[PDB]
Design a protein around this ligand. Structure first.
Ligand code: HX9
Ligand code: ZN
Length: 255
């Protein structure tokens, strides 16, 4: 199979006699195919930065092992040279500690696997706008990726209502350094939607929300380049192309 870096893939496996899906010694979780009773599904995601060239997954069955080969593709991402390699910046210690703290909290939430569907049918777009900056737009030095856009920016004047892309449980609902006023929703199966730079948060941690329910107001919080909604998807442990993901998910769970 082939997969563009920074994208997710839905692997289809036979259910009967299935034991384990493995990436070397890492376990990949599985969930029901919602239409085909004989199949299960796994989410496999490639990181945008420094992906392997090739992956081998092994589905272990009681009666057999099946190897899955995935070739990593570069895709057609927008990319710009910078002319300063200053990878080590010297923030104030207050900033350094807030970032490290918020990183630790995020890692703990994305670690808490929900082995159940919290969602309800297809993902909606969180507002009726258009993309102003694409997922995966890269900054390069040494023909190497130094940084990338890890979600997608929607056109939103300050105070635009933002609605939950799908049902789930709010796990983050506060002000963070890089994301500003942030909402993060667990949808189950390690799938998380992310709404950043909000001017107002209308949900609390641990709240069950419904698809199309108000989660806050768009803003420019934490945003140098002006007001927008930043929308992200974390799936299979990685930030992935969110409209590509929503499209692949919806093809499976719409009906
Ligand atoms: C690096 C990147 O392109 N986008 C994300 C980071 C991904 C979410 C994840 N990490 C943090 C720090 O929150 C989490 O821990 O939940 C961001 O915060 N702002 C970007 C610059 C933007 O482009 N705004 O428009
Ligand atoms: Zn963004």
């Amino acid at each position: 199979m082939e997969l563009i870096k920074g994208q997710a893939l839905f692997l289809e496996l036979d259910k009967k006699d299935f034991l384990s899906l493995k990436n070397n010694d890492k376990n990949i979780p599985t969930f029901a195919h919602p239409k085909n009773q004989e199949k299960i599904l796994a989410i496999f995601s490639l990181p945008y930065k420094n992906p392997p060239q090739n992956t081998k997954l092994i589905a272990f069955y009681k009666d057999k092992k099946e190897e899955i080969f995935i070739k990593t593709l570069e895709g057609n991402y927008k990319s710009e040279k910078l002319q300063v390699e200053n990878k080590k910046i010297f923030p104030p210690k207050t900033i350094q500690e807030r970032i490290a703290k918020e990183l630790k909290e995020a890692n703990a939430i994305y670690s808490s696997y929900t082995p159940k569907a919290l969602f309800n049918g297809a993902f909606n777009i969180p507002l009726n706008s258009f993309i102003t900056s694409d997922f995966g737009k890269a900054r390069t030095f040494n023909e190497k990726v130094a940084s990338y856009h890890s979600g997608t920016d929607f056109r939103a004047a300050t105070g635009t209502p933002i609605y939950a892309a799908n049902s789930g449980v709010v796990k983050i609902a506060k002000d963070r350094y890089f994301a500003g006023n942030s909402v993060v929703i667990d949808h189950g199966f390690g799938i998380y939607s992310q709404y950043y730079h909000l001017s107002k948060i209308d949900v609390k941690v641990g709240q069950k929300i419904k698809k199309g329910e108000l989660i806050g107001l768009s803003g420019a919080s934490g945003r140098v380049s002006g007001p927008a909604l930043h929308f992200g998807i974390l799936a299979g442990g990685k930030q992935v192309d969110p409209l590509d993901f929503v499209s692949k998910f919806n093809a499976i769970f719409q009906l």
